[PDB]
């Protein structure tokens, strides 16, 4: 049985609270059994236990910043799996802060995970700051 894992790199967009991602830099996409769809979601072919994680660095100046790992399963409404908050910095022009989210979840075939934040324009895209991934147990 192949190893199933993905690690995708943050991507800015002038377009929404859903973060975008790219397969570029030091990314991982072990095979077609996980895909990055529409630059926004990691979608799994196979039911099972996965460790799913996200880290988000943002740069803000002073409602908290919230990042949410969301699940869209076939036939089900979107739901939050994990959420992390951080007060806005007072640093000028902005202060950087990081959030890490991670945990083990049952995914159904064709299930998709994505990351939403209070302000996508404030996310830091410098090398290594913001990433999203999963591995099948």
């Amino acid at each position: 049985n192949p190893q199933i894992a993905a690690h995708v790199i943050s991507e800015a967009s002038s377009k929404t609270s859903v973060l975008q991602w790219a397969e570029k830099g030091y990314y991982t996409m072990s095979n077609n059994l996980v895909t990055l769809e529409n630059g926004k979601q990691l979608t799994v072919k196979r039911q099972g236990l996965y460790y799913i994680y996200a880290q988000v660095t943002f740069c803000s100046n002073r409602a908290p910043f919230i990042a949410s790992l969301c699940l869209k399963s076939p036939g089900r409404f979107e739901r939050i799996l994990l959420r992390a908050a951080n007060t806005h910095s007072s640093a000028k022009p902005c202060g950087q802060q990081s959030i890490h989210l991670g945990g083990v979840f049952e995914l159904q075939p064709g299930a998709s995970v994505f990351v939403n934040v209070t302000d996508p324009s404030q996310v830091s895209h410098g090398t290594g700051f913001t990433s999203f991934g999963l591995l099948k147990l």
């Epitope: 002038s14 030091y26 990314y27 100046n61 000028k92 022009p93 902005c94 895209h125 410098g126």
Partner: antibody
Framework: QVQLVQSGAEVVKPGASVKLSCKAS????????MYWVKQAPGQGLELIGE????????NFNEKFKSKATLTVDKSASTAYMELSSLRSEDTAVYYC???????????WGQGTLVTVSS | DIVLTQSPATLSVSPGERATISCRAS??????????MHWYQQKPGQPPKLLIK???NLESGVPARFSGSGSGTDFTLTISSVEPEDFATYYC?????X???FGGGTKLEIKR
Amino acid sequence: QVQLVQSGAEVVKPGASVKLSCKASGYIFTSYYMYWVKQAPGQGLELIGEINPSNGDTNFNEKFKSKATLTVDKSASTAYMELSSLRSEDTAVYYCTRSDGRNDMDSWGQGTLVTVSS
Amino acid sequence: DIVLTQSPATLSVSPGERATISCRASQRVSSSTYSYMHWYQQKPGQPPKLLIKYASNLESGVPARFSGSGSGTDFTLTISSVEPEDFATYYCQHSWEXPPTFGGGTKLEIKR
């Protein structure tokens, strides 16, 4: 029309600083990344760094980390780059450009010539 | 850092001739969905102008005679039929990782 208008040419001595401006119009200034690019006489294009006008967050090409300072004035839709301890090797045309995704750079300023000479 | 090598350094063509130029990256800049390679035109004293984004996408307002192709380490820009306003230097750029770098340029020169 999307437009980036840069400040006029500078002729300075070594040890000087200059502050270059890039005035954006015809789009939502905070929605696009801005890059500064160096083109030395007869030469190609060299990335200096990027700024997110939304918050002021910057990333630099390691070469320009001590040479360049990037800021914005959101209210004036203007980006600025300060170049410090200028030497003859800083002689170049400097561009500001916008980027919707930090991939392609879809609009460029006309360039500002900086001449550093004793 | 990624290095982009453009060939040829100079291409001599007439108006009404097809021009193809190439860009070779020091490592692959393609993945499942996109190639992070962009092409620009620059005339002397003028800023670069975007022509092709993500290897093959014609920038809005750019004439249909411009096209881009390629994947992995190797990319081409083609002008189907050169016009007088096309003589210029052409530059490739990656957006694969930090920093973005540009090729050394291909000069499209008037053949006689």
